[PDB]
């Protein structure tokens, strides 16, 4: 499957692509404003994620740090990123279909559109100014808007035993972005696409 990762933000981002225990394609790359990065994701990939990382510094060896979404100090992510990270999530060729969603369960750093580039389904978007509207207790000093699980580490926000409901914090993400997961047991906003579709993840789709 091909994914084009496009940075429409006015600021540089460091895109990342991982399935948690491995990089997807090269795993990460600097994307200046306007740049596009084309990756290949193996069919049948379950639990893949693409995200942006902000305000990074990497040396010639690909070692460094990001203010948001850092993946163990590496340019080329093998693991998932540190919240806050708006997430484009996907599981491909699952019983003949692809499943895509955007999630705020690990917080929000950059607005995103995640859409198919082939036919048969629709895209999803979370492009509201969540960082500007972020509740004071969730604001991440390094930048972005943390989710409540990251901040408070409670069973209610983290949804531990799969025993939770919506919260004042999850409702904030849901009000600003109804089409993105706001907590673990949120009514799914997953889109079912034809198996083996191609997609585009656009950071800052509205500017």
Swiss-Prot record:
Subcellular location: Cytoplasmic vesicle
A GO CC term assigned to this protein in UniProt: cytoplasmic vesicle
Transmembrane segments: none
Disulfide bond sites: 9-204, 56-66, 71-77, 121-193, 126-177, 134-145, 149-158, 159-164
Entry keyword set: Cytoplasmic vesicle, Disulfide bond, Signal, Taste-modifying protein
Primary location: cytoplasm
SMART domains, alphabetized: THN
InterPro entries recorded: Osmotin/thaumatin-like_sf, Thaumatin, Thaumatin_CS
PANTHER family, per database record: OS03G0233200 PROTEIN (PTHR31048)
Function statement: Taste-modifying protein; intensely sweet-tasting. It is 100000 times sweeter than sucrose on a molar basis.
Family membership noted in the UniProt record: Belongs to the thaumatin family.
Record protein name field: Thaumatin I
Protein species of origin: Thaumatococcus daniellii (Katemfe)
